[PDB]
Each structure stands twice: as structure tokens, then as C-alpha cells.
Amino acid sequence: SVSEIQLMHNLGKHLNSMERVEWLRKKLQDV
């Protein structure tokens, strides 16, 4: 329960290390 920007940041790092790097750019292209 935060802001749309902060919500993407909260779900854009847990993955592993290199997963968040590709997830913040390839998500909008392929969800």
C-alpha cells in the first residue's frame, strides 16, 4: 500500500540481482 512508482520499486529488486535489471525494462515489452 504505497504509490504506483514506489510499488514498481518494491516489486523490482527481490528477484535475485540481474533479474530486476531485465525486469524493469522487458516487463512493459513482455508482461
Curated annotation (Swiss-Prot):
- The lineage's top-level taxon is Eukaryota
Q: Where is this region: Important for receptor binding?
A: 20-31
Compartments in which it is found:
Secreted
Q: Mind listing the UniProt keywords for this protein, alphabetically?
A: Cleavage on pair of basic residues, Disease variant, Hormone, Secreted, Signal
The UniProt entry lists the main location of this chain as secreted
List cellular component terms (GO). Answer: extracellular region; extracellular space
The protein's GO terms of the molecular function aspect are: hormone activity; parathyroid hormone receptor binding; peptide hormone receptor binding; receptor ligand activity; type 1 parathyroid hormone receptor binding
Known consequence of changing L28A? Strongly reduced affinity for PTH1R
A Gene Ontology BP annotation from the UniProt entry? homeostasis of number of cells within a tissue
Q: What is the effect of changing W23A?
A: Strongly reduced affinity for PTH1R
Question: Subunit structure of this entry?
Answer: Interacts with PTH1R (via N-terminal extracellular domain).
The free-text function statement in the UniProt record for this protein reads: Parathyroid hormone elevates calcium level by dissolving the salts in bone and preventing their renal excretion. Acts by binding to its receptor, PTH1R, activating G protein-coupled receptor signaling. Stimulates [1-14C]-2-deoxy-D-glucose (2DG) transport and glycogen synthesis in osteoblastic cells.
Q: Disease linkage in the record?
A: Hypoparathyroidism, familial isolated, 1: A form of hypoparathyroidism, a disorder characterized by hypocalcemia and hyperphosphatemia due to a deficiency of parathyroid hormone. Clinical features include seizures, tetany and cramps. FIH1 inheritance can be autosomal dominant or recessive.
Q: Which family does it belong to?
A: Belongs to the parathyroid hormone family.
Instruction: Tell me what this protein is called.
Output: Parathyroid hormone
